[PDB]
């Protein structure tokens, strides 16, 4: 169905309501799709909310490799049309009752927003990278004094972001305008 | 009218189509045979049936519950808690009062065979390198001894397993902690004070006892040399037990059995 | 001669030869096909049993064990490459896989051989965490556990903990569960020690495996009201509406009946706000595009926060709540029985068309309260705050859809719809 | 350490004292929301005496301050609920518990 | 100290390794949603009374959902029909749940009852749109946690006919067979020694449980009524030979149901009237006349074996009554 | 049923199990079988009753059951020997030829070695047990032992085995007479 288009489906099981079965189908040995059923069909549909999925090996224009000293997760792509992706790690780090802080330390020192509020939530690691002709931006689990993940950027790094996010299902192309709420 | 439609369906299924899954056809044919014979179930079950009284019900219920717990424990591998529960159940069935007034009920229930199949599981694993779970062996041996003692027929029942248990009768001896509970002692108790069983005691096992006695008189027990005993050139313990069993086998009711 | 130290490479490394030999021996132990005559299948079974017996009685299981020992001293194909050559480096993985397959085929059916080498499980479970042969090691351990019950006697807490850590590290594998099943019972007999170990070490934390629960079906109700603030045409940015209840029930079948109320945002200026997709246990407040209140806690993004209030109680019968909403500087507010609550959802995203909504699970009788012909207010609105019967645009009707879609208990005569537009309308000419 | 958050008042008149039997209907849950117990699933209320050391302390001392018909949220502490060992199989060590307890009758 | 050393089991390992679970996940659009077959049926007043806007909802409706923890997301049970990996994994999970308490181990069953739920099992056995494998797994788990122990304890004493000499025992000496009748199997009076049944109540707020010796408690009357109703529905469904049996094929519909009915019949429920109704389901001369697959007739064989064993027991009891 | 029994006897094991089903049905199959016209009409109804089941595989089923015991005197061979007797009552050259063809097409030794092992340990009147039972009876009224007073063990089994070996060569089947040597 297209924009503002509503319809109706009939898989059978109501021959008293089926209209054009006797006109065509009744004589050539054609049967309704749900004539011999004791219950209705589940009627699956296409969902809108875009959840996270693992990168499949048979996926064009998005390749994710794995190496391994330090452990890295390199990327790759071969395409002609560009967009923005929303790559995310699978397992999220949970925070206890007391601990509730998060600082983004770049190449230099800690200079970012003070997003340090989490009583007890799950923060899934993620990076939103734009797809260039060559996109070698990747994530590296490193260590200095505590849990540190370095999403190492490369040339043409001006619109890719990297942070930690809870369950969030929104597909678009924006910098801010993220949903928020402050409870007093 | 149940046999009618059962036999009808029974022949109809097999005639309709060839049937894979041999367990299905096995169950089908045993059902058909049961329906046609009829009295086979009766002749099978009446030996295993029993009636007691309308007064002693809680006691026999406790006995049956303990026996069911024993059987359920048989279906599980032996551990420390398993040994503890088995010992508790054996004590309970020994202390129950129905155990004495109706000894035929125990044979009809096959309790001796259950205890026998528990002790064989414990006695397995090894032959001369481990006698682990000794209390479980002792409890089974004393239960079987008591079971064979209070009867005339339970001795005949245990005489069948006497042949097997003489192969591993060497366990539990050479230690004055179980002068009672022992496979050799339960063998002696089964063949004790019955001229019929003493005669029926042929010679597939008297020579076995003689070889065990000779081995004992030629080699001392390594456990003794480990404890710190002066290592005499022979063993006076396993020999004494074998001699006691042979005495029980030869002498009966005050008159020596001539053939034995 | 290559792995002991740095020696001259005049060594015989039959890489392709040993690969072909393993590929032939694996088929040499190929189990008979199930699509075969019964007597021919039994003949092949007896032949393979005799073969396995003669191969085991020569101690070649220990030989392939030593081979995989000497091959496991590396870490990856790259580690083996710069030491043993390009061919050996690129074939090391396949050689390890073939060796594990051969070891499994040699023990697939025999009860004697497994009881012979059961003493090597202390090594098998230790190298089980190689991560490049874990499938082979797991299959081998499964085939050796399902055959001999004595091997379960030597499985200690360390082995079970290692298997559970493998299941926690390598993801959801359906073969680890089969291995644990064979660890619980082997041949009609159970081992209480291993059962207790599994139950006490695998699922106390509930992180694994997949948990489950029985929740209620919740729905939402909203009127045909849309509130959009921006530069230019505005709607006074002030709204207010009340809610009362006639009869309620806390626990209808097994759980507390869902009952929340608040204001939900939208995506842009179009319907279908983002949240719990549909037909779940998510009402208002269970997402970042809705803000609700239920009498005890304030819900925002499926996270509740308790707030103080005079006589704080659940929304029992004959309770009148009134929701106020200003858009620009302040935020949504709730007052229970007139006296306001001590919390509000300040500094939230004002993008979207807000609308009042109420979420309920079952066993509920709720009444929206507006002014005019739609209802009658029970209390007095604060100064300025208008209502939804006034928020409706002039010369348009006002009804109540559910929240998004055709959440109606109807037959096949349901008007399934595709995408929609942003109402085509959500300044003069220069 | 146990704290109480009332949900529905129970007229605060009858309180459990030593030597009585209380009838409760509760659906416990872990700290992360993972439900681990309930008395509404089996559709049979939970009967227990007060002061006989048969239920957990975090439950008994909390129930001893409630009223008839009063629903409450009982938040427990690991040392007062199960300690550093927890319940083998269900409760992990050093875990807090939450009980939604309603008092049906107080005898 | 590390990212990987925070969401895994071990934490004292400062080496930054990456387990295979760590894989990049992108926001994808290839996803299907399932429209439920039952809704809430909310009725608006439609009168627009001058005293408010009325909305009413009375009929309850529930559903079960899996919770993936490392994704922190809830998914309805029926959505597993498409995802074969989660379906197979949860089937094996149910198999493991049944295996850890297979034999007479009750310390673990008391934990598993709360580990899954009490009535969620009832919902799973009641649901029609189940993937089949999950339906069979839940049926087996329900049998294992409660019914299996007493069923086995009662089946071990099935060939041992101990009968007291009570005045009530001296009443079936007629065993009605003359005047053109044969009676009904399992109908009459037993007065035979059989192991008593008792289930303990699963409670984990009670410290120092006495022994939890027997089994977790489970409501049997609702279960037997529910089994009779579904068995009637199942035979009515199979009589017409549709193409959508409950749980996929017809074996998934019949095998777990007939297995649960058989183990219920073993354990000493279905008093006389219930046995009459279950008999009239098959006896009229049904279920034995249908075209049934091999796993269904395999359970029918055991059912008939029990119907013959009860007749043998009745004969033995009559023998004792006359011998008195 | 015959194919089920044949497959059960063909499955490779180390000891012939009890198999109560076989012990129950091979007796029904054995008792199913059995002035010039009055003696030939019954011989023809006997041929008909034997053809009612030896063309369904019983001739090979008996052979496989005897071969699957490798010389162990038990209640399984004691019932298959009676089944063979019932199937070879009289000179049934057809059944003899079917068994001979089976033994020649499946070159198995586990049948002849099983026959040798069974015959080598059938029974012998022992005098020691006889006088022992006599002394037991003289001392006390001990109940008589069922299996021939425990002095001749399974004499019926021995007679059935040798009657089976005779019926295998009954008539003048020189082929089987030479194949038995």
UniProtKB/Swiss-Prot annotation, chain D:
GO terms for biological process: 'de novo' protein folding; calcium-mediated signaling; insulin secretion involved in cellular response to glucose stimulus; negative regulation of calcium-mediated signaling; negative regulation of heart rate; negative regulation of insulin secretion involved in cellular response to glucose stimulus; negative regulation of release of sequestered calcium ion into cytosol; neuronal action potential propagation. Its EC number is 5.2.1.8. InterPro entries: FKBP-type_PPIase, PPIase_dom_sf, PPIase_FKBP_dom. Keywords: Cytoplasm, Isomerase, Rotamase, Sarcoplasmic reticulum. It is found in: Cytoplasm; Sarcoplasmic reticulum. It catalyses: [protein]-peptidylproline (omega=180) = [protein]-peptidylproline (omega=0). PROSITE patterns: FKBP_PPIASE (PS50059). Gene3D superfamilies: 3.10.50.40. Pfam families: FKBP_C. It is an enzyme of class 5 (isomerase). The keyword Transmembrane does not apply. It comes from the Eukaryota. One of its GO terms (cellular component) is sarcoplasmic reticulum membrane. GO terms for molecular function: calcium channel inhibitor activity; calcium channel regulator activity; FK506 binding; peptidyl-prolyl cis-trans isomerase activity; signaling receptor binding; transmembrane transporter binding. Inhibited by both FK506 and rapamycin. Residues 19-107 form the PPIase FKBP-type domain. Detected in heart muscle (at protein level). Isoform 1 and isoform 2 are ubiquitous with highest levels in brain and thymus. The keyword Isomerase applies. Its main location: cytoplasm. PANTHER family: PEPTIDYL-PROLYL CIS-TRANS ISOMERASE, PEPTIDYL-PROLYL CIS-TRANS ISOMERASE FKBP1B. Identified in a complex composed of RYR2, FKBP1B, PKA catalytic subunit, PRKAR2A, AKAP6, and the protein phosphatases PP2A and PP1. Interacts directly with RYR2. Belongs to the FKBP-type PPIase family. FKBP1 subfamily. Has the potential to contribute to the immunosuppressive and toxic effects of FK506 and rapamycin. PPIases accelerate the folding of proteins. It catalyzes the cis-trans isomerization of proline imidic peptide bonds in oligopeptides. This is Peptidyl-prolyl cis-trans isomerase FKBP1B. It comes from Homo sapiens (Human). The gene is FKBP1B.
From Swiss-Prot, chain E:
Homotetramer. Can also form heterotetramers with RYR1 and RYR3. Interacts with CALM and S100A1; these interactions regulate channel activity. Identified in a complex composed of RYR2, FKBP1B, PKA catalytic subunit, PRKAR2A, AKAP6, and the protein phosphatases PP2A and PP1. Interacts directly with FKBP1B, PKA, PP1 and PP2A. Interacts with FKBP1A and FKBP1B; these interactions may stabilize the channel in its closed state and prevent Ca(2+) leaks. Interacts with SELENON. Identified in a complex, composed of FSD2, CMYA5 and RYR2. The lineage of its organism: Eukaryota, Metazoa, Chordata, Craniata, Vertebrata. This is Ryanodine receptor 2. Belongs to the ryanodine receptor (TC 1.A.3.1) family. RYR2 subfamily. Highly expressed in heart, lung, cerebellum and brain. Detected at lower levels in adrenal gland, stomach, thymus, esophagus and ovary. It is found in: Sarcoplasmic reticulum membrane. Cytosolic calcium-activated calcium channel that mediates the release of Ca(2+) from the sarcoplasmic reticulum into the cytosol and thereby plays a key role in triggering cardiac muscle contraction. Aberrant channel activation can lead to cardiac arrhythmia. In cardiac myocytes, calcium release is triggered by increased Ca(2+) cytosolic levels due to activation of the L-type calcium channel CACNA1C. The calcium channel activity is modulated by formation of heterotetramers with RYR3. Required for cellular calcium ion homeostasis. Required for embryonic heart development. The gene is Ryr2. Channel activity is modulated by phosphorylation. Phosphorylation is increased in failing heart, leading to calcium leaks and increased cytoplasmic Ca(2+) levels. Disruption phenotype: Embryonically lethal. Embryos die at about 10 dpc, due to defects in heart tube development. Cardiac myotubes display enlarged rough endoplasmic reticulum and cytoplasmic vesicles that contain high levels of Ca(2+). It comes from the Eukaryota. The calcium release channel activity resides in the C-terminal region while the remaining part of the protein resides in the cytoplasm.
């Amino acid at each position: 169905l297209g924009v503002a288009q509503v319809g109706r489906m009939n898989f059978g099981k109501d021959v008293s309501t089926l209209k054009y079965f006797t006109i065509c189908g009744l004589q050539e040995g054609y049967e309704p799709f749900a004539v011999n059923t004791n219950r209705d069909i589940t009627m699956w549909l296409s969902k809108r909310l875009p959840q996270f999925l693992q990168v499949p090996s048979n996926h064009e224009h998005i390749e994710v490799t794995r190496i391994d000293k330090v452990t890295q997760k390199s990327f790759g792509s071969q395409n002609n049309n560009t967009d923005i992706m929303f790559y995310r790690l699978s397992m999220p780090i949970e925070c206890a009752x007391x601990x509730x802080x998060x600082x983004x330390x770049x190449x230099x020192x800690x200079x970012x927003x003070x997003x340090x509020x989490x009583x007890x939530x799950x923060x899934x690691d993620s990076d939103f990278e734009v797809l260039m002709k060559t996109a070698h931006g990747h994530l590296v689990p490193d260590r200095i004094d505590k849990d540190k993940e370095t999403p190492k950027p490369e040339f043409n790094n001006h619109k890719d972001y990297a942070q930690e996010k809870p369950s969030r299902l929104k597909q678009x192309x924006x910098x801010x305008x993220x949903x928020x709420x402050x409870x007093x | 009218s149940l046999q009618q439609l059962i036999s009808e369906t029974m022949v109809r299924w097999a005639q309709e189509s060839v049937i894979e899954d041999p367990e299905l056809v096995r169950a089908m044919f045993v059902l058909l045979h049961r329906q046609y014979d009829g009295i086979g179930g009766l002749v099978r079950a009446l030996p295993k049936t029993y009636t007691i009284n309308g007064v002693s019900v809680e006691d026999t219920i406790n006995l049956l519950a303990s026996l069911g717990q024993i059987r359920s424990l048989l279906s599980v591998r032996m551990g420390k808690e398993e040994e503890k529960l088995m010992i508790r159940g054996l004590g309970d069935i020994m202390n129950n009062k129905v155990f004495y007034q109706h000894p035929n009920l125990m044979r009809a229930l096959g309790m001796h065979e259950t205890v026998m199949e528990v002790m064989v599981n414990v006695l397995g694993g090894g032959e001369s390198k481990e006698i682990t779970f000794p209390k479980m062996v002792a409890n089974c041996c004393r239960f079987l001894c008591y079971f064979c003692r209070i009867s005339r027929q339970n001795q005949k029942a245990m005489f069948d397993h006497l042949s097997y248990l003489l192969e591993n009768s060497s366990v539990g001896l050479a230690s004055p902690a179980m002068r009672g509970s022992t496979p050799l002692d339960v063998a002696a108790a089964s063949v004790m004070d019955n001229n019929e069983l003493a005669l029926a005691l042929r010679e597939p096992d008297l020579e076995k006892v003689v070889r065990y006695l000779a081995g004992c008189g030629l080699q001392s027990c390594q456990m003794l040399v480990s404890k710190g005993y002066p290592d005499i050139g022979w063993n006076p313990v396993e020999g004494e037990r074998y001699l006691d069993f042979l005495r029980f086998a030869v002498f009966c009711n005050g008159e020596s059995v001539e053939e034995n | 001669a290559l792995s002991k130290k740095v020696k001259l490479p005049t060594i015989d490394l039959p890489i392709e030869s040993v690969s072909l030999s393993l590929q032939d021996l694996i088929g040499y132990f190929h189990p008979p096909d199930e699509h075969l005559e019964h007597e021919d299948k039994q003949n092949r079974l007896r032949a393979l049993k005799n073969r396995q017996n003669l191969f085991q009685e020569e101690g070649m299981i220990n030989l392939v064990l030593e081979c995989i020992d000497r091959l496991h001293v590396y870490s990856s194909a790259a580690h083996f490459a710069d030491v043993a050559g390009r061919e050996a480096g690129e074939s090391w993985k396949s050689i390890l896989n073939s060796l594990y397959e051969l070891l499994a085929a040699l023990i697939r059916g025999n009860r004697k051989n497994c009881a012979q080498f059961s003493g090597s499980l202390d090594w098998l479970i230790s190298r089980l965490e190689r991560l490049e042969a874990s499938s082979g090691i797991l299959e081998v351990l499964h085939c050796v556990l399902v055959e001999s019950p004595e091997a379960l006697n030597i499985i200690k807490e360390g082995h079970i903990k290692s298997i559970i850590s493998l299941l926690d590290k390598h993801g959801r594998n359906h073969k680890v569960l089969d291995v644990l099943c064979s660890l619980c019972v082997c041949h009609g007999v159970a081992v209480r020690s291993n059962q207790h170990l599994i139950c006490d070490n695998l699922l106390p934390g509930r992180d694994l495996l997949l948990q489950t629960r029985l929740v209620n079906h919740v729905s939402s109700m909203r009127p045909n009201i849309f509130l959009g603030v921006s530069e230019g045409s505005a709607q006074y940015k002030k709204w207010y509406y009340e809610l009362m209840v006639d009869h309620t029930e806390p626990f209808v079948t097994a759980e507390a009946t869902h009952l929340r109320v608040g204001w939900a945002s939208t995506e842009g200026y179009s319907p279908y706000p983002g949240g719990g997709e549909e037909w779940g246990g998510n009402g208002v407040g269970d997402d970042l595009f809705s803000y609700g209140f239920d009498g005890l806690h304030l819900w925002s993004g499926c996270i509740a926060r308790t707030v103080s209030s005079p006589n704080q109680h659940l929304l029992r019968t004959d309770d009148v709540i009134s929701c106020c909403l200003d858009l620009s500087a302040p935020s949504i507010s709730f007052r229970i029985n007139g006296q306001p609550v001590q919390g509000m959802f300040e500094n939230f995203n004002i993008d979207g068309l807000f609308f009042p909504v109420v979420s309920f699970s079952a066993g509920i009788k709720v009444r929206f309260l507006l002014g005019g012909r739609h209802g009658e207010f029970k209390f007095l609105p604060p100064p300025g705050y208008a209502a939804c019967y006034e928020a409706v645009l002039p010369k348009e009707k006002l009804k109540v859809e559910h929240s998004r879609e055709y959440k109606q208990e109807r037959t096949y005569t349901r008007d399934l719809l595709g995408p929609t537009v942003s109402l085509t309308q959500a300044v003069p000419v220069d | 350490g146990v704290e109480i958050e009332t949900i529905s008042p129970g007229d605060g008149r009858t309180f459990p004292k030593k030597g009585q039997t209380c009838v409760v209907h509760y659906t416990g849950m872990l700290q992360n929301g993972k439900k681990f117990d309930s008395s509404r699933d089996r559709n049979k209320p939970f009967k227990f005496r007060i002061g006989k050391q048969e239920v957990i302390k975090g439950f008994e001392e909390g129930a001893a301050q409630m009223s008839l018909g009063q629903r409450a949220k009982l938040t427990c502490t690991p040392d007062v609920a199960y300690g550093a060992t927890g319940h083998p199989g269900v409760i992990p060590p050093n875990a807090t518990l939450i009980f939604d307890v309603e008092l049906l009758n107080l005898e | 100290p590390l990212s990987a050393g925070l969401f895994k089991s071990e934490h004292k390992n400062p080496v930054p390794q990456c387990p295979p679970r760590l894989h990049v996940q992108f926001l994808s659009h290839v996803l299907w949603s399932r429209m439920p077959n039952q809704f809430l049926k909310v009725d608006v007043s439609r009168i627009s009374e001058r005293q408010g806007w009325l909305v009413q909802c009375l009929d309850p409706l529930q559903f079960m959902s899996l919770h993936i923890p490392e994704e922190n997301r809830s998914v309805d049970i029926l959505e597993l029909t498409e995802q074969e990996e989660l379906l197979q994994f949860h089937y094996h999970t149910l198999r493991l749940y049944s295996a850890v308490c297979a034999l007479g181990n009750h310390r673990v069953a008391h934990a598993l009852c709360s580990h899954v739920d009490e009535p969620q099992l009832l919902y799973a056995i009641e649901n029609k749109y189940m993937p089949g494998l999950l339906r069979a797994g839940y049926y087996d788990l329900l049998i294992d946690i409660h019914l299996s122990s007493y069923a086995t304890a009662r089946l071990m004493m099935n060939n041992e006919f101990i009968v007291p000499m009570t005045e009530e025992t001296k009443s079936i000496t007629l065993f009605p067979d003359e005047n053109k009748k044969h009676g009904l199997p399992g109908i009459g009076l037993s007065t035979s020694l059989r192991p008593r049944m008792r289930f303990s109540s699963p409670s984990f707020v009670s410290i120092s449980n006495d022994c939890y010796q027997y089994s977790p408690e489970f409501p049997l009357d609702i279960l037997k009524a529910k089994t009779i109703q579904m068995l009637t529905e199942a035979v009515k469904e199979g009589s017409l030979h549709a193409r959508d049996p409950v749980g996929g094929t017809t074996e998934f519909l019949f095998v777990p149901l007939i297995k649960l009915f058989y183990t219920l019949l073993i354990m000493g429920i279905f008093h006389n009237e219930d046995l009459k109704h279950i008999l009239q389901l098959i006896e009229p001369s049904g279920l034995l006349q249908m075209k049934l697959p091999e796993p269904v007739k395999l359970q029918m064989c055991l059912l008939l074996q029990y119907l013959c064993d009860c007749q043998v027991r009745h004969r033995i009891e009559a023998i004792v009554a006359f011998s008195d | 049923l015959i194919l089920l029994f044949s497959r059960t006897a063909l499955t490779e094991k180390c000891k012939l199990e009890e198999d109560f089903l076989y012990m129950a049905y091979a007796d029904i199959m054995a008792k199913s079988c059995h002035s010039f016209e009055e003696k030939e009409m019954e011989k023809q109804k006997l041929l008909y009753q034997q053809a009612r089941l030896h063309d369904r595989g019983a001739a090979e089923m008996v052979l496989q059951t005897i071969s699957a015991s490798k010389g162990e005197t038990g209640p399984m061979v004691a019932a298959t020997l009676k089944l063979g007797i019932a199937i070879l009552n009289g000179g049934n050259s057809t059944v003899q030829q079917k068994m001979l063809d089976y033994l020649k097409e499946k070159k198995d030794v586990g049948f002849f070695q099983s026959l040798a092992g069974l015959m080598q340990s059938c029974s012998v009147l022992d005098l020691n047990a006889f006088e022992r039972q006599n002394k037991a009876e003289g001392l006390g009224m001990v109940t008589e032992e069922g299996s021939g007073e425990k002095v001749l063990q399974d004499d019926e089994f021995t007679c059935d085995l040798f009657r089976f070996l005779q019926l295998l060569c009954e008539g003048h089947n020189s082929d089987f007479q030479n194949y038995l040597r």
